[PDB]
């Protein structure tokens with residue numbers, strides 16, 4: 001009598017963030033304690049991201065905004081990301097404060113801002129900027145991550161995790177897996193007795209390549225993962241819902257980059273959010289060999305996810321009927 | 323060259339049919355894959371043909387050739403018109419394109435980590451030795467587990483209870499020929 005929902009998708013598609021919204025909306029949410037557990041992760045996010053920005057400034061040959069910052073850049077590439085704590089994506093507060101000055105100055109350097117604008121050439125999460133723009137609140141000694149910071153915190157998922165919750169006597173078991181190519185080898189261990197599959201796709205990564213090989217287009221990879229999944233007979237009697245996520249990031253992106261420059265099979269106004277969403281929808285629908293539900297979400301917007309999941313919930317129930 | 327922020331987190335992270343028809347564990351992964359994704363007939367057809375090389379020709383016929391078999395495959399007109407080695411050889415020939423795509427798709431997905439039992443195939447492909455006989459024993463033992471697993475959760479192969487069973491019996495028959503049983 002349990003409703004078993006699979007969260008599937010490529011790496012960084014919003015799977016865990018969707019699961020945190022479930023907890024917020026249909027669970028006990030996160031209190032000061034729960035949220036305070038994300039601080040180490042958020043500090044790891046900032047430090048490691050700045051170090052990528054600094055390394056990219058040098059390797060891309062982008063002039064410093066201010067040459068004196070070459071010193072901080074160095075104090076940053078000196079951070080040992082392989083030390084025991086940092087290797088688990090955790091940084092202690094007092095360590096974080098020691099680097100705050102070098103980081104805050106670095107973020108103000110116009111040359112670091114230039115590397116950022118060209119992130120599609122290397123590997124970075126858009127969330128670092130959110131946190132970089134909020135250093136004044138992470139700088140406070142008594143810093144406690146807001147609910148918003150918790151949803152933006154970035155922690156790569158590895159393995160299989162289950163989250164049981166309830167929505168009016170109905171029992172729900174939500175399975176969260178990793179999306180990297182190496183984590184996918186594990187998916188098959190949670191395929192049985194599945195009720196539905198929520199398939200997350202970052203609609204904004206059409207101008208990006210994979211972390212696994214730095215060559216494969218990120219949207220191209222989702223299309224292919226979706227193809228193997230939407231055509232597996234093990235799911236023939238399982239509803240599959242598509243979540244074109246990060247819609248907020250796609251809105252910003254279609255203004256500065258043309259998807260036409262990546263998918264020549266595209267037609268229409270590349271700078272029109274509506275035309276790009278139509279195309280993305282057509283590409284996924286086009287992968288089915290022979291009932292495709294979809295929503296445009298922004299997993300970090302609690303209110304957006306509440307409306308959407310309400311609709312997904314009645315879909316997963318009325319379909320499980322036949 | 324440029325540093326990735328999640329690069330350290332993941333640090334430690336079937337060319338042709340003729341090449342996989344004698345490797346039971348790898349063939350089971352492909353077989354499994356094809357059964358959940360495409361039309362299982364073509365591949366089961368080529369594996370049984372190769373097994374033929376007289377009474378094991380009536381089986382093959384009622385399973386793949388005769389227009390009514392649960393596992394029918396496209397036959398060249400000429401063949402379907404009419405030596406015994408000619409047809410089988412030809413029938414196989416007309417499955418290549420279909421089996422070529424299935425193979426290709428399987429190789430792509432595997433690079434993507436989307437194919438079944440990569441873990442078992444990794445542990446297996448890992449072990450080293452010069453003892454062919456004992457290496458093959460390892461292949462079979464793994465293949466048994468996989469075959470055992472294919473038989474269990476297979477009602478998902480097809481709705482046609484007869485189809486999914488024609489598929490399982492077809493794979494068991496072939497697995498049996500390579501020394502693999504459940």
Ligand SMILES: Nc1nc2c(ncn2[C@@H]2O[C@H](COP(=O)(O)OP(=O)(O)O)[C@@H](O)[C@H]2O)c(=O)[nH]1
Nearest residue numbers: 012013014015016017127151152154246298299
């Ligand atoms: N701006 C924005 N960020 C998002 C959205 N969804 C997820 N993220 C962020 O993208 C990163 C990866 O999200 P995550 O849940 O860890 O992806 P997973 O790898 O599929 O679990 C995080 O830092 C999330 O905060 C979104 O809709 N908009």
Ligand code: ALF
Nearest residue numbers: 012156157178179
């Ligand atoms: F990038 Al993942 F789970 F797919 F953190």
Ligand SMILES: [Mg+2]
Nearest residue numbers: 015016156157
């Ligand atoms: Mg995750």
